[PDB]
Design a protein around this ligand. Structure first.
Ligand SMILES: O=C(COc1cccc(F)c1)Nc1nc(-c2ccccn2)cs1
Ligand SMILES: O=C(COc1cccc(F)c1)Nc1nc(-c2ccccn2)cs1
Lengths: 193, 193
């Protein structure tokens, strides 16, 4: 049952590594999953729904990793605290580059994809802002910008910069440099007066 | 001659304020410009070429404004120096929100739009990096990140954050707060040690 669902998802993720969603047919997904086209439609109403499910899995993987980190703070300096958190997104989305790029494209055409991305970005920004606020309350960070506005810009920077790096866009930060680049900008803007 | 070309461009910019490019027909552009459909095709091969021309005009407007500022440095502090430069993009793209949003969408489907955007982003990043380097050479900024990598991330942050604000995305920084937000992040990350 879900084995055929997982087979469809794995086929789609593998096919997206070499071609975009518009060049993959339902017949391609069914054939790769070892089922017929009508059997595919039992599990998913469309190839777009397959991508939505793939992206939901990736974003919830990142969310759960961040939740785990929040409950188990690593015992290091403040810079490496932010690095460990940004690295959740670097590693999670960087391990699913094809789904990440396909999902970014689908945001312009899928209301469900756009709402999924917006929901989680709001959650992650609210968490960033709450950590900034806690740092200000304990006297470690200065009260400069409104924390939620700062958190919004830093999270949008990460979205755009990580995704440019993973896609090899021109221009982009090399993937092997992008974590250090983002960590520098986060730490200086959160703690700088 | 170019009056009919300008009329086509003005019609397209006005129509894009209420509907996306996929819901505007060549007949719509011709009718609004007071010409027939074949006469339209004398001036532009497609509605996509009309948008490409509109975006080229906007990006060159921003580029020329930045060039003007580079040749005529305002006499203020370092923070207001960066603010005046970021404000070129805030004001130029914020005065053409409909073309900006349509051009961003077209990047996924138009090679010419993607190459136009990439060309100018490379130019603006190289200028940012050169100013950072000059600030380091005179002892005003510390030698932290590679200047070009820092410049890349800051310019991608501005692209994503300004465009989210102009589009009213959820999440986004309010348009009335986004210049101050970006200036803070630029100044702290360029001058912070
Ligand atoms: O890039 C991020 C999230 O932004 C995104 C979102 C989607 C895609 C993407 F590529 C990046 N960083 C974050 N870090 C924290 C953090 C909180 C406490 C301690 C350490 N880090 C919280 S959100
Ligand atoms: O947002 C920017 C350019 O990035 C973009 C690019 C496209 C669209 C968009 F919305 C933003 N800021 C820049 N500022 C400078 C600057 C150089 C010296 C002194 C002061 N400013 C140089 S590029």
């Amino acid at each position: 049952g879900d084995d055929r669902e997982l087979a469809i998802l794995a086929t789609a993720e593998n096919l997206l590594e070499d071609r975009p969603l518009a060049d993959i047919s339902v017949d391609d997904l069914a054939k790769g999953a070892g089922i017929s086209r009508p059997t595919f439609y039992f599990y998913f109403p469309s190839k777009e729904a397959v991508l939505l499910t793939l992206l939901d899995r990736v974003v919830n993987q990142a969310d759960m990793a961040l939740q785990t980190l929040a409950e188990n703070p690593a015992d290091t300096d403040r810079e490496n605290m932010w690095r460990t958190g940004i690295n959740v997104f670097f590693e999670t989305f960087g391990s699913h580059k094809a789904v990440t790029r396909a999902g970014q494209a689908a945001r312009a055409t899928s209301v469900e994809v756009a709402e999924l991305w917006s929901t989680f970005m709001q959650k992650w920004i609210a968490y960033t802002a709450a950590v900034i606020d806690a740092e200000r309350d304990r006297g470690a960070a200065p009260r400069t910008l409104p924390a939620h506005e700062l958190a919004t810009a830093l999270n949008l920077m990460n979205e755009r910069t990580l995704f440019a790096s993973f896609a090899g866009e021109q221009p982009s930060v090399p993937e092997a440099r992008v974590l250090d680049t983002l960590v520098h900008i986060w730490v200086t803007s959160i703690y700088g007066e």
